[PDB]
Design a protein around this ligand. Structure first.
Ligand SMILES: Nc1ncnc2c1ncn2[C@@H]1O[C@H](COP(=O)(O)OP(=O)(O)OP(=O)(O)O)[C@@H](O)[C@H]1O
Ligand SMILES: Nc1ncnc2c1ncn2[C@@H]1O[C@H](COP(=O)(O)OP(=O)(O)OP(=O)(O)O)[C@@H](O)[C@H]1O
Ligand SMILES: Nc1ncnc2c1ncn2[C@@H]1O[C@H](COP(=O)(O)OP(=O)(O)OP(=O)(O)O)[C@@H](O)[C@H]1O
Ligand SMILES: Nc1ncnc2c1ncn2[C@@H]1O[C@H](COP(=O)(O)OP(=O)(O)OP(=O)(O)O)[C@@H](O)[C@H]1O
Ligand SMILES: Nc1ncnc2c1ncn2[C@@H]1O[C@H](COP(=O)(O)OP(=O)(O)OP(=O)(O)O)[C@@H](O)[C@H]1O
Ligand code: NA
Ligand code: NA
Ligand code: NA
Lengths: 208, 190, 133, 133, 133
């Protein structure tokens, strides 16, 4: 697996450092010299290049990468022309960071395999946490079912609450001072909690 | 619950639209007139103001909001001075979007209740998906346990494999009691 | 002792010249090449560096200085990030030139040992002289 | 008495606030609109004007002030032409904020009654404190 | 004799070409690289330097010139600090190109031996020709 990350910003630079940490060959490309110097130690290869130029793109041997990530999300012209070149160069997987809804529509027309909205996805997740302070993190399995990680419940056993049949929801795990429990069989004392169930049913448990 | 979102960018604008959709009173503040006009329909109140000025901050009645979100993540001076003013104004919860590690350190000194790295958090999650194409989405319960949503497994019963399987998705149908929960090392084995 | 003065302006350059005149080892740091050349003869060591970068800060042996004076008073971002790095490097004394009241509050949060208002302090003394002349 | 402060910076603004606090009639002049609005409440009269223009200077009744303080210390051209106009208008006392040694010499030639170095004077006091701490 | 012309504009460059044509040693100084290259062949010595810096002025051997012509007529700060430095280095004759009436007064205070108004003087001759044509 050889990965190319084009554009070293907050999003693109984070991908380079994480992939390099996992032990992958990463080519970091950016048009700004200061960015490339900073990430020269966090990538296998770091090049100062303009990704909108076909000659510079071919000078990098970009055809040797299965995955190319275009992490340019504030320059629509630079973002769309880069992915147009990569599609012309027959890159199998092209993942692009989109700016707005109109940028997303263009990238879908010119063939971006995956389109990413980092700030928009995080903003929705943060806004869910703001609305319900109990909700610490959640993953949306579907449009009606989700897994949500959450003093009345304190000193209460699992068998004490019958939300297993009352709400049709299952308690996946409970965190006890840095200790996790898998398949918690009642009864277990709840101290001052991961649950999977229907989205409406989960809200019922938070109420009671 | 009254929420104030300061700075209407990709991150701040997303919070305003989502909170407004859920039916909450949102005050959208931005120094750019074009941004405020765009989000005037996605907020209860939209104001063109400089959040680094105390007089403009008081003109908004910012003390009436329990939650203020400072979504300025490319202007460190504007971000840190805004949160310094809000802390001086005794706002209970101040959530700030940080730019880098040094910006994160400053905001922790001047008392930001929660510090958010939107692009950095997404970049780590995207990089996990790049490394393993099977991994579609995941939530890290701990540093050793996580829930990961994922042709050899095709036409194979659950009892056929003796490897907990939380749920399986069947053409838009979910079953309760491929989503698996287990140890991080053990998940890689599967 | 050894003094490091970061930012060679009217206030920072005046500290270097006075300390160097008194016979002290002074390290002069400025991001502007022209400033460093001017103060090369007025400092024991003059370096062109960006104080907001940790690697450049460590290249100067900044840990060897008991006193570091941050004399950037118009760039709040450069001033606050410099003293944040110096606080991390466990510098005993950090004296910073503040721009306004809000800059003073930020520096007090991030551990500036002493905060200086050169123009504001002089402006009060001049105003006192004007009133009672 | 009546004081006119031209240039609302860190040094000029500090003079206006201190004099206004003591209960004196202060005219605040600055070419920047944002500065004048900020100091509108801290001065008896705050005007947006260019002090290098004689017509704008006469529009303010600058002849009515015994003391005029020119607090422009980074623009040598604006500082020296202002005090040249004030000297022509026969202002009794003109106090000017100098930038460097050469600016001090020019102002002394064109009749600045008193020349002030805020950052340089504070930098010597700070350096004395550092040496004997 | 030896002439130094500082500032290669329409007026300064015309002096260099005419003096060099007459067979005189002319030192051409300009802060702009493009101007110096253009007048490299029209001067005995052409240097890219900032005339407001004393060290750069001494690097040129400016004390060896009896006549120095300061031909900066749109930058009052650069024009007045140059002739202030030249007056300090004891240049016998300093001829300066003035911008307006106020610039003329400043240069007369800081010891400009002769002050020239090229456009103003030509504008009067042209106006005389227009009236009586
Ligand atoms: N043509 C180009 N080729 C390569 N890199 C480029 C090009 N144009 C811009 N970049 C770089 O891509 C990076 C990301 O672009 P930019 O900063 O505009 O986007 P962004 O959406 O604000 O980023 P992020 O949110 O990830 O910080 C920057 O470092 C920029 O210098
Ligand atoms: N002082 C300020 N007061 C209010 N709003 C401000 C201020 N400074 C900037 N903003 C606004 O905040 C928003 C976000 O700022 P900016 O674009 O610098 O951050 P960002 O990290 O690039 O944002 P995002 O990634 O969410 O798009 C912009 O709409 C900008 O106009
Ligand atoms: N990141 C930096 N690292 C080092 N020096 C810097 C940095 N940023 C600015 N400087 C220098 O610090 C000096 C002082 O900064 P600045 O001119 O902005 O402040 P000031 O308040 O106007 O200062 P002064 O009143 O002392 O003249 C300048 O010479 C500037 O070039
Ligand atoms: N021609 C002018 N007329 C009036 N005010 C002016 C003029 N030129 C500049 N000023 C103002 O004078 C003030 C001080 O000038 P400047 O910022 O250049 O000096 P400084 O040495 O940095 O000052 P300080 O150290 O007091 O902050 C500024 O608010 C500036 O807008
Ligand atoms: N500090 C300086 N040292 C040397 N040369 C300088 C300096 N500042 C400006 N000059 C040069 O002096 C020349 C004349 O200056 P400028 O163009 O501002 O005046 P001017 O009145 O428009 O002149 P002219 O009418 O002769 O064209 C220019 O070539 C300019 O680059
Ligand atoms: Na962003
Ligand atoms: Na100053
Ligand atoms: Na001309």
């Amino acid at each position: 697996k050889q990965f190319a990350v084009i554009g070293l910003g907050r999003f693109g630079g984070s991908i380079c450092k994480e992939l390099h940490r996992m032990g992958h060959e990463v080519l970091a490309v950016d048009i700004n010299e200061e960015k490339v110097n900073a990430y020269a130690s966090y990538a296998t290869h770091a090049v100062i290049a303009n990704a909108t130029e076909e000659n510079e793109l071919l000078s990098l041997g970009i055809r040797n990468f299965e995955y190319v990530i275009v992490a340019i999300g504030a320059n629509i012209q630079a973002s769309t022309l880069t992915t147009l070149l990569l599609k012309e160069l027959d890159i199998p997987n092209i993942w692009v960071k989109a700016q707005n809804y109109y940028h997303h529509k263009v990238l879908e027309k010119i063939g971006a395999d995956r389109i990413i909205h980092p700030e928009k996805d995080m903003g929705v997740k943060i806004a869910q946490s703001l609305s319900d302070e109990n909700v610490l993190n959640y993953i949306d399995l579907s449009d009606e079912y989700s897994i949500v990680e959450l003093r009345k419940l304190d000193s209460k056993s699992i068998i004490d609450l019958n939300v297993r049949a009352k709400y049709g929801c299952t308690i996946l795990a409970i965190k006890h001072h840095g200790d996790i429990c898998l398949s918690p069989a009642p009864e277990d004392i709840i101290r001052e909690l991961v649950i999977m169930g229907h989205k409406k049913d989960i809200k019922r448990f938070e109420n009671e």
